[PDB]
Ligand binder design. Sequence first.
Ligand SMILES: *[C@@H]1O[C@H](CO[C@@H]2O[C@@H](C)[C@@H](O)[C@@H](O)[C@@H]2O)[C@@H](O[C@@H]2O[C@H](CO)[C@@H](O[C@@H]3O[C@H](CO[C@H]4O[C@H](CO)[C@@H](O)[C@H](O)[C@@H]4O)[C@@H](O)[C@H](O[C@H]4O[C@H](CO)[C@@H](O)[C@H](O)[C@@H]4O)[C@@H]3O)[C@H](O)[C@H]2NC(C)=O)[C@H](O)[C@H]1NC(C)=O
Ligand SMILES: *[C@@H]1O[C@H](CO[C@@H]2O[C@@H](C)[C@@H](O)[C@@H](O)[C@@H]2O)[C@@H](O[C@@H]2O[C@H](CO)[C@@H](O[C@@H]3O[C@H](CO[C@H]4O[C@H](CO)[C@@H](O)[C@H](O)[C@@H]4O)[C@@H](O)[C@H](O)[C@@H]3O)[C@H](O)[C@H]2NC(C)=O)[C@H](O)[C@H]1NC(C)=O
Ligand code: HEM
Ligand code: HEM
Ligand SMILES: *[C@@H]1O[C@H](CO)[C@@H](O)[C@H](O)[C@H]1NC(C)=O
Lengths: 457, 457, 100, 100, 79, 96, 52
Amino acid sequence: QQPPCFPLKIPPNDPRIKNQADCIPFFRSCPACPGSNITIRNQINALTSFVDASMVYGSEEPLARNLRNMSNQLGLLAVNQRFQDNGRALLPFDNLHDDPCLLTNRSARIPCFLAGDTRSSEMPELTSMHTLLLREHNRLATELKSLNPRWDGERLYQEARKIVGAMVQIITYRDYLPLVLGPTAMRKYLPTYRSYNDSVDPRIANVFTNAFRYGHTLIQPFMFRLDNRYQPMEPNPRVPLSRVFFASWRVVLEGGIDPILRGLMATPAKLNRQNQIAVDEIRERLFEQVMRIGLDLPALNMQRSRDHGLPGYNAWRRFCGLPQPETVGQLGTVLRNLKLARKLMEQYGTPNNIDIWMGGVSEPLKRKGRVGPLLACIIGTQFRKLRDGDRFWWENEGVFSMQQRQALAQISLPRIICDNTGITTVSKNNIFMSNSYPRDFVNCSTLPALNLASWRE
Amino acid sequence: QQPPCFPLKIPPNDPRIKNQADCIPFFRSCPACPGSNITIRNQINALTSFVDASMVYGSEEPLARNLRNMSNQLGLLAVNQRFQDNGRALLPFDNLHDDPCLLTNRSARIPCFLAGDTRSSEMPELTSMHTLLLREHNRLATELKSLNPRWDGERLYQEARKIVGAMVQIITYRDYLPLVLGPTAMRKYLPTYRSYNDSVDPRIANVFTNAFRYGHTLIQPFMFRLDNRYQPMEPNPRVPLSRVFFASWRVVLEGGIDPILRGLMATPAKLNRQNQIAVDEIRERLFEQVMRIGLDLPALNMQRSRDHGLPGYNAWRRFCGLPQPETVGQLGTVLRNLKLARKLMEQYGTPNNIDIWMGGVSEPLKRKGRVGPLLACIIGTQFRKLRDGDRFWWENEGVFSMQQRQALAQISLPRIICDNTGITTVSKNNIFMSNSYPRDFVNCSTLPALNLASWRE
Amino acid sequence: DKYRTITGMCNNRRSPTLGASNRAFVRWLPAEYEDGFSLPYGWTPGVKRNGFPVALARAVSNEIVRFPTDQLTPDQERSLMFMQWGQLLDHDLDFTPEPA
Amino acid sequence: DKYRTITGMCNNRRSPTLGASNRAFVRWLPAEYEDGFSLPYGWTPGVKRNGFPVALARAVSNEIVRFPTDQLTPDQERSLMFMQWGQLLDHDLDFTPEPA
Amino acid sequence: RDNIQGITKPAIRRLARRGGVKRISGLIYEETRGVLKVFLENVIRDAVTYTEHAKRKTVTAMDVVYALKRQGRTLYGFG
Amino acid sequence: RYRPGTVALREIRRYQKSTELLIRKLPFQRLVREIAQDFKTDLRFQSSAVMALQEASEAYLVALFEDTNLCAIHAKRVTIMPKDIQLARRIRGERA
Amino acid sequence: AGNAARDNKKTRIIPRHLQLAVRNDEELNKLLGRVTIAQGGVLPNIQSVLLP
Ligand SMILES: *[C@@H]1O[C@H](CO[C@@H]2O[C@@H](C)[C@@H](O)[C@@H](O)[C@@H]2O)[C@@H](O[C@@H]2O[C@H](CO)[C@@H](O[C@@H]3O[C@H](CO[C@H]4O[C@H](CO)[C@@H](O)[C@H](O)[C@@H]4O)[C@@H](O)[C@H](O[C@H]4O[C@H](CO)[C@@H](O)[C@H](O)[C@@H]4O)[C@@H]3O)[C@H](O)[C@H]2NC(C)=O)[C@H](O)[C@H]1NC(C)=O
Ligand SMILES: *[C@@H]1O[C@H](CO[C@@H]2O[C@@H](C)[C@@H](O)[C@@H](O)[C@@H]2O)[C@@H](O[C@@H]2O[C@H](CO)[C@@H](O[C@@H]3O[C@H](CO[C@H]4O[C@H](CO)[C@@H](O)[C@H](O)[C@@H]4O)[C@@H](O)[C@H](O)[C@@H]3O)[C@H](O)[C@H]2NC(C)=O)[C@H](O)[C@H]1NC(C)=O
Ligand code: HEM
Ligand code: HEM
Ligand SMILES: *[C@@H]1O[C@H](CO)[C@@H](O)[C@H](O)[C@H]1NC(C)=O
């Protein structure tokens, strides 16, 4: 347990790990001030605290410059020089001292992908999203260059970056959050846009990095791929999630990203229930091939919350203005469950010691939502701070013209997917809701395309 | 101009300092993290952020242990072993490498006094208050020893310390704050005590160290001493303030602390007006004897606020919910003065750049108060946080019994003044309000003394 | 100010470092460490958190989160794209580095 | 847990270091430095604040605070013990150290 | 004279909306009219008694204020 | 077209921000005169008296409707019903 | 009342401001618990149950 190692102790009678002397690997976060007898320990955020599509353009000058294709004056982004997806762009490769992508399968010899985020190679889905965004940026830059032949590479790159960031913000705040918080919490915590506060702090809260891990309860135990007719693509249509962690060779040498996107569109998510929190695939076989032994994602979340020194469940309930339980009965009433409340009370000993993540995922879901009142409050507060404190918000005056805003308000994720890939059948509007084929799938020729005529100069 | 030095520049046509190459000495505060690029600069609070009579018992274990009378078992505080004030205790002397008290009077050779704070010898009034508190602690310890003969030294010391802290808290929150904030701000920011709220942060805000400097506007340009008949005591009935800085020899060798306390109790303060902010003694002759040139207390306050990186006047007005001026007319309306608003606009250029101290002291005073609405907001918030977030508050259950609380509720400053000092005539209740003789002075034979019969074991 | 910066600097004119990259988080609540400043709960065996022993995170996951995988149910009103966009937005927002 | 601690620690059970001595201040508003983290306004000539030049502190103290001492107005409702107790309570609350 | 019907359905709807009511059933208008009639009858009876004691034929605002005050419904702004 | 519940919320926001009277003055004056006709005949009313009666009646009805809304919410409902008004009046001690 | 008017961006004082001042202070609301202020309106309050 010598620093900076904080391994997870193994309790007795553990179903998986029989040896008590073993421990789960764990590394403490980097302190803000390395070595101090005065300052309270604080963590470091290495990425911009804005919704600015930093996943594709990076967050530092050297990496961002390396990500650009500085060989012509088209203002494009670097693509893979060795592999193609049916004649379409692919993410550039990365050079690392230790590469888990090569460790996953030594026969293929496919290194990890290079993008604005170092974790963009965890699964084929993230690589598919990053490649889709890169293709969209390249198409926007090419269209702008054709429309405005007098511009240079830097201007085209900046304009395409601005458009991509605006699209990300629009899609997020118009489709994702209303389905997360629910209409009541959406109206309570994220009202209509008024103007630009410069007095709102846009920094990311420490608790948020845990409160946003609720998606770990939406993880399905399989990765699904579908062919053109939205049928199970063979061989291996449903592949285990333990065999896709850091496996980039499933993108280059397994038919590209189109089947992955098709399976992404036409597969229901996992519902969060008080007796079904997280699947065993991520709870017992996380990074099994990459590491010596598998990890435990909920346990890792709890240990990270403890490492950051986040307060308990009751402190965050009081911070959000909600009643704070103290006994078994009050906790059961709050959770609308007595068996789960009894188990939590036995394990922790008092509600004040319940971890933020576990308490948040134990709370019942809101009406037409996916989070409890505490998690919904935290997420809504953080995203409202991000939106109101951002000077370059698309709806803010002086950033986009009225015609540009009107054109941008008509975008949609299915339009981007159908334009940037070979997919001809895409789901209806609110892609985060349609999951049944062919109940709510259209021919993609009816969806309007973004009009760039307002960008002429 | 090299770190940590932050010298004050001299404008052209300065009335005092004709030369421009000279500068006022100034040192930047010690940062919380000595050298970093990830963390914003923060300052250090070297004292306990509680109303716990930390002026006398220190805030560090070595100093607290060094301040006691370890030679006996009576649990008293160390007193001066060379001088006495007509048979009464005096503060112990201190050993410093560069003693400033010796420079004021080379013939006397009286070093600075030693107490729980390093700035206890700035003027004889602070020394008198410290000596009075030490005398009260010693008297309480002696009375407790007489009442309970079986107690040890440490128990007596702790009990006397608790009584002194409770007395200080009672005096402050019952007499001083209502006369500062005024009834409206006192009721708004300091409501009735309910219980101990462990979720209140009791730390001292950074702006408070600049918001509480309003007392620099109440300084009279003289020090007044009165004899037993409250007549001007000769020689030197009124001493210029520029000659009493760091002059401890005026305490030991000029009759003691009786005339200083008498002058404090029976002399009007200086009213704060928008055309008379601070006198010229603290503005042009601060620490004149000690250093080469005098300092500028308002300029020092403003430069210290700049060093701490505090926001401007408008940001703090927005923080407290008050409207934010933007133009000269709005500033004149807010300040209820046009000449001052015009001067401020000419000097700064915009209300957002006005420093916190100047903005706070320029505002018109509250009704029956002594600070503007912004300073009242900041001070009330800070003191409510201090009271509610303190576990050992004198009204908190378990700290004192009901009989002890009833006995402590009857304490007052005049009783302490005329109990441990040769003063026989003291002001009526609310010492801070009565300033005329003999209109509102009593014989000290009518004020009941503190009853310790409830401390029996 | 025609376009965004790449490091987030100077987005807020009053405080350019606010919301930038490689900067410390903002603490909505004071930290709760075992020794007070820089030690987590469970680092030192035998210590208690608010009068109760600290439970093992792995044990908590074992006795609560675990459930048979054949009882899993799907969501009839969501899709996997929901989870994927959640992850993408999260990777957009924050990332906490750790030593190698 | 019968009397106070000299250092001030353990006053808050959840976070023992809250309200102790030799600890960093709490910021109610984000800091506003010249470069963003570790530079005061007016450190370097030619740099303006919020689009306006930074006024020399001595200059404004000369042109605003200064007033002839002869016209001092005594306070008929307060005494000097007001200021003295204010200073004493201040010396209780806070003290910002500087290097020697 | 059926002037009790002068209090229309939109007026009662506005009064309920001011009170925070979102949905209103159609059977509560008669109940509201009856309640208003009872309250007005009581207050006006007290006011008329006050006027009659003073040997007057005009019901002043002060009489109504006193009638409201004697029922624990003090009204500010009319004397 | 607007889904039900939106215009109601807009009206709630609007009428909670204004201070104007919500009952027509002439019908209320006629009702007051009709009611007062029973106790005495040939009565004269000052305008201030009618205004005070209207203000008191409106305030009483608004408070009663707030209590009725609380009663309806207690029974897990959104729609105001006469039984809620009766329960509020009985608890307050008016019809008890 | 003057603070309420200032926050409302107005100069004069009207009965609405007096009602806002009274109803937003706990002690003053308790003191004037059975008092009706003419042309005062009501405090904005919408129950969360009826919210969409
Ligand atoms: C014990 O003390 C606790 C702290 O008390 C504070 O300090 C003392 C000195 C007093 O000044 C006191 O008034 C202070 O609150 C106290 O807990 C506090 O309780 C309040 C009320 O529940 C909490 O406020 C809620 O917080 C969030 C968001 O508010 C702000 O959070 C962000 C974080 O930075 C800020 O940037 C923004 O300004 C946000 O406004 C919300 O949940 C909530 O707003 C909603 O509240 C209800 C929801 O039902 C709605 O009616 C409202 O319209 C809003 O939609 C509140 O603002 C506060 O966070 C919390 N503080 C702490 C530190 O936990 C506690 O109640 C005291 N206990 C007792 C028994 O008195
Ligand atoms: C721009 O937004 C700021 C900040 O708004 C915050 O963030 C947005 C996203 C929303 O969540 C808001 O609800 C948040 O407030 C607005 O200025 C704020 O105005 C309010 C109301 O006047 C101020 O709150 C006051 O603060 C005082 C109490 O101090 C509080 O903090 C201390 C220390 O933490 C502590 O004692 C306790 O937490 C206190 O509550 C007091 O005067 C008063 O009661 C009131 O609560 C708030 O401080 C302001 N925030 C800032 C950062 O200055 C602006 O109004 C908005 N602008 C526009 C144009 O809409
Ligand atoms: C779908 C499969 C996913 C996998 C395999 C995965 C894996 C991981 C792992 C191993 C970590 C490190 C945790 C730690 O260091 O404490 C992490 C971090 C994180 N995950 Fe996930 N995750 C997935 C989905 C999601 C989703 C959908 C979300 C949100 C909607 C999410 C939210 C987070 C957050 C906020 C962090 C931040 C941790 C930090 O910054 O230190 N995860 N992810
Ligand atoms: C009466 C004579 C006083 C004198 C001669 C005096 C002198 C000083 C000086 C020279 C400083 C150093 C400031 C700096 O270096 O930036 C200081 C600090 C300070 N003074 Fe005064 N002061 C007096 C009274 C008061 C009073 C009555 C108050 C409040 C009611 C007060 C409030 C403060 C504060 C808050 C500080 C900052 C503390 C710190 O920086 O650690 N002063 N004083
Ligand atoms: C302090 O200690 C000395 C030791 O010589 C002793 O003489 C003196 O009386 C003590 N102080 C008091 C106030 O008793």
